Write a protein that binds this ligand. Structure first.
Ligand SMILES: *Cc1cc2c(cc1C)nc1c(=O)[nH]c(=O)nc-1n2C[C@H](O)[C@H](O)[C@H](O)COP(=O)(O)OP(=O)(O)OC[C@H]1O[C@@H](n2cnc3c(N)ncnc32)[C@H](O)[C@@H]1O
Ligand SMILES: *Cc1cc2c(cc1C)nc1c(=O)[nH]c(=O)nc-1n2C[C@H](O)[C@H](O)[C@H](O)COP(=O)(O)OP(=O)(O)OC[C@H]1O[C@@H](n2cnc3c(N)ncnc32)[C@H](O)[C@@H]1O
Ligand SMILES: CCCCCCCCCCCC[N+](C)(C)CCCS(=O)(=O)O
Ligand SMILES: CCCCCCCCCCCC[N+](C)(C)CCCS(=O)(=O)O
Ligand SMILES: c1ccc2c(c1)[IH]c1ccccc1-2
Ligand SMILES: c1ccc2c(c1)[IH]c1ccccc1-2
Lengths: 495, 500
């Protein structure tokens, strides 16, 4: 058997971050990665036509200080997602160009409804502990409702409901009826709230890595060399003995003092445990699916939308549109002009049955309508990735919690099981579901093990992160009117 | 590599029924069973104190003809669960003895609400195809709501809502808020409806197997001999070559023309697939958890409840009661007096913290109050099984579908993946979640492979089952009043129109 201090299961960002921290501490780490590549839910494809493209996780932003610090240490640079020109909200078959993070509404009733919806999500969020959403004072009430129910309750307008729906679909690549209100509200609040999560400028979509996010995992793999074992899917973990035994599908045996599980919680199901997992984890890892998304990048000779003062961001309401949300994916040099769009939630399932060429045509025709340009009909290249297909991801971006699960099982997610500690973005308390959360969880799990080894004190397991100098956070602000305008039922009570 | 025609993954009733059918058709079958035993979610414990006790699936009933036929063929007999004396509905700290399948109410408004709740469950069920619940006209609308939301819409009394909630908890060992309304309405409909599923006499809980339901799998294992491989958890299935390769955790390799997956759908995750599963299945097997239950059996010197004219059936409403439902589990001979109780859904999680001795005390104190009997405080023995703990079950009784899942993923539950066919009770179209469904699905998967091999025509894949002559099904009947009494909103609509 191959003997080491710690086996890290999964060479995604979380696993790689944990392995790098343990390696840097002088421990012998081995990273066992199921795939023939590192990066997991990050994947950067290189070819002459795109140079490079992120087909998985890509965007980083302010307050994601851990992924920015790790990336900078590995010699990576960020550039800003193009948000110079106008965003588009495409509503009832018409493009409404706008500026700012939130699509505007003109109907005064609809305005109150929209304002109240975003405000209420953050108000509810403020009662949900980041590290313990199940401790929210109304945790049971909110966990026992879907986002669909909450939105049906809150939204007096079809307009607000459709945008809130799009927002849920885009945040968590799931339907409003699929997810716990408590979990969703937690999810938003632990990314710093509605503005932070939805924003390009000053939000989660501000930046991308020059040369692609896959370089974070690739360059930690560069550092660790042969400590990374590719095509080593872990099938079995045995903690009955002095040392933990980790077995891979190619029959290899790894012996460690401790294990970090840096895989999506539900992919814990692909590992056979001895002894059995405790009851609550045994059931938890069956209750926590990942969302559904196809990431699609259409390439053009030029970023022709910029000529019409569109930045390439499109928010596209309604069932018919295959893509509800797009960003400009042009390279910082202004070449390899491209529009990135997500086919979200049920549409990922619906449109997966088409050919690549058919999806390209649907995307091109949608983009020609929304951008109002025939140039959208003349793609020079197309790249796409359906994350629903991935045995070793389960989906993207992340794990959602259906109604009732977070309150009953949420405490389990990072509870050590003897000498197995849990990393993975799902176990983060901030930007859980992001590359940031991956780094937070990997490093926290690694330091749980350093604490178990008597190498660090309890108070050093959870470590704050200095703010990035390259990507500083600007405060999230609201207006007096946004804070105090009445809800639609608020305005009715008054009449 | 160990070569055969069909590898069956899982030695529950479904995989055993599949293996038996294929074996009986002249094929070379292997059953790869993860545990040191067969039976899966069925498990008959034997010791001197209890003689035998089903800690898992136990009850069979009218319309469950496939399990009755399979059991009978294996030499098993059934007996009737005790329903001679009064059932108890325990609501708000008081016991109300009654007779008949549904706890009665006297309050006329409450009467219309209860009547309408049960009627509406079945009315909605009649819209849902057993084999394609996603084809219900309102499939999307019903699949996008929880049972909590549907009860909130339907129940105009707290009384009906509390009984309805208990009904859901008891039926699918899940909270009303955890489960799809479409799926739950399908689930009840595919068991023959509210009366059939809830009833002891003339329903799902009418009978038990003499000696325990574990005998079904054990006796099929005896028939198959060494073809059943215990402690062979499957870890890897490879379909990239001419023959399917199935690898187990101990590194044994099996080579087959075809595979039957007879494991709960989500436990499909414990297998690494080459090539990868198609997208829809890849995601479906992460979206379908099993419910949560502790089955608890408290033993007494005598079935002392019978002397107070109580059959041992207690429907116990509300949060404090660890157990919401009990049946007399006394042996047919009248000895090893016992009360079987379920600790359901969240209470299974909540009370698993306690010691066995502490759960026993809580159950006795409950039974003492519900039965008005100090004798309930004098148990002689106790057995329990928390199914939440089982790596190779995931829970009990069965897989539930959270909102949105059944319409998006439902269609691939039993869709073959190249040379893998899917059995297990979850893939049944009648009494899915039950031993009956396990038999239906195992046999159907087996016949799919027989069809793929050109051994039978397509029209023999799905086979009807002759009605058991031993457990005849009384039809489910409604009275004129039951069909036409207005809902509470129907009564209110009538009152509106009279005053006009
Ligand atoms: C897919 C996706 C993700 C994504 C997103 C868009 C798409 C289409 N956009 C994002 C974004 O713009 N910014 C961001 O921060 N995140 C975005 N996401 C999410 C992001 O990619 C993930 O949160 C992050 O990559 C998660 O990292 P983590 O390290 O937690 O998880 P992982 O990448 O899934 O890595 C797990 C690795 O484990 C291997 N694996 C799985 N099972 C096994 C077994 N049994 N044995 C060994 N290895 C295993 C996986 O192969 C993977 O490499
Ligand atoms: C647990 C339970 C179930 C139950 C119930 C009460 C409880 C507490 N009450 C019931 C009742 O009164 N009447 C009834 O008809 N059903 C009742 N249920 C449900 C019933 O037990 C189940 O529907 C039924 O037994 C399911 O049979 P099925 O054959 O579909 O599935 P299974 O029993 O889970 O068997 C699966 C087998 O597969 C093995 N396994 C799992 N993973 C693997 C891998 N990777 N490799 C190989 N084998 C695997 C399991 O060990 C199991 O044996
Ligand atoms: C009207 N809608 C928004 C449909 C429900 C009001 C919710 S509530 O009446 O405020 O609960
Ligand atoms: C008048 C308000 C009473 C609501 C009663 N409940 C049962 C709560 C809802 C009825 C739903 S529906 O309104 O019948 O669709
Ligand atoms: C709200 C709004 C937009 C996004 C998100 C949440 I996760 C993300 C990743 C890439 C593009 C866009 C998003
Ligand atoms: C409704 C009512 C009662 C039951 C069921 C559904 I699954 C069954 C198995 C054992 C006891 C009770 C039940």
């Amino acid at each position: 058997s191959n003997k080491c201090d710690v086996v890290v299961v999964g060479g995604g960002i979380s696993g790689m971050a944990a392995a790098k921290l343990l390696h840097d501490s002088g421990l012998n780490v081995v990273v066992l990665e199921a795939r023939d590549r590192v990066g997991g839910r990050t994947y950067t494809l290189r070819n002459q036509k795109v140079k490079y493209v992120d087909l998985g996780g890509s965007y980083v932003g302010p307050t994601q200080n851990r992924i920015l610090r790790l990336a900078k240490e590995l010699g990576l640079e960020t550039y800003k997602v193009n948000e110079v020109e106008r965003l588009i909200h495409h509503v009832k078959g018409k493009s409404y160009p706008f500026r700012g993070p939130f699509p505007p509404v003109w109907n005064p009733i609809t305005y109150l409804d929209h304002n109240n919806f975003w405000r209420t999500m953050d108000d509810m969020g403020r009662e949900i502990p980041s590290d313990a959403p199940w401790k929210a004072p109304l945790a049971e009430e909110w966990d026992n409702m879907t986002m669909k129910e909450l939105l049906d309750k809150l939204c007096w307008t079809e307009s607000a409901k459709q945008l809130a729906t799009l927002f849920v679909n885009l945040c968590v690549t799931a339907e409003t009826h699929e997810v716990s209100a408590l979990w969703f509200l937690w999810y938003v609040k632990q990314c710093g709230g509605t503005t932070r999560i939805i924003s390009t400028t000053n939000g989660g979509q501000e930046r991308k890595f020059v040369g692609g996010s896959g370089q974070v995992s690739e360059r930690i793999m560069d550092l660790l060399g042969d400590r990374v074992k590719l095509e080593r899917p872990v099938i079995y973990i045995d903690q009955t003995r002095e040392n933990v035994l980790v077995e891979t599908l190619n029959h290899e045996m790894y012996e460690a003092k401790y294990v970090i599980s840096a895989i999506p919680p539900t992919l814990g199901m692909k590992i056979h445990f001895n002894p059995p997992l405790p009851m609550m984890r045994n059931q938890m890892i069956t209750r926590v699916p990942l969302g559904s998304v196809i990431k699609c990048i259409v390439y053009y000779k030029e970023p022709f939308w910029r000529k019409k003062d569109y930045c390439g961001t499109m928010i596209i309401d309604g069932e018919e549109a295959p893509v509800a949300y797009t960003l400009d994916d042009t390279k910082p040099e202004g070449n390899y002009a491209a529009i990135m769009g997500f086919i979200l939630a049920h549409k990922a399932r619906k449109l997966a049955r088409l050919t690549k060429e058919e999806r390209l045509k649907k995307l091109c025709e949608l983009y020609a309508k929304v951008l109002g340009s025939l140039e959208a009909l003349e793609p020079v290249h197309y790249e796409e990735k359906n994350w629903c297909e991935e045995q070793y991801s389960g989906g993207c971006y992340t794990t959602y919690f259906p109604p009732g699960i977070l309150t009953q099982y949420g405490r389990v997610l990072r509870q050590p099981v003897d000498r197995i500690y849990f990393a993975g973005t799902e176990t983060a308390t901030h930007w859980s579901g992001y590359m940031e959360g991956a780094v937070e969880a990997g490093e926290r799990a690694a330091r749980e093990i350093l604490h178990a080894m008597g190498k660090i004190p309890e108070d050093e397991i959870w470590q704050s992160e200095p703010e990035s100098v390259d990507v500083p956070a600007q405060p999230i602000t609201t207006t007096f009117l946004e804070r105090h305008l009445p809800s639609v039922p608020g305005l009715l009570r008054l009449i």
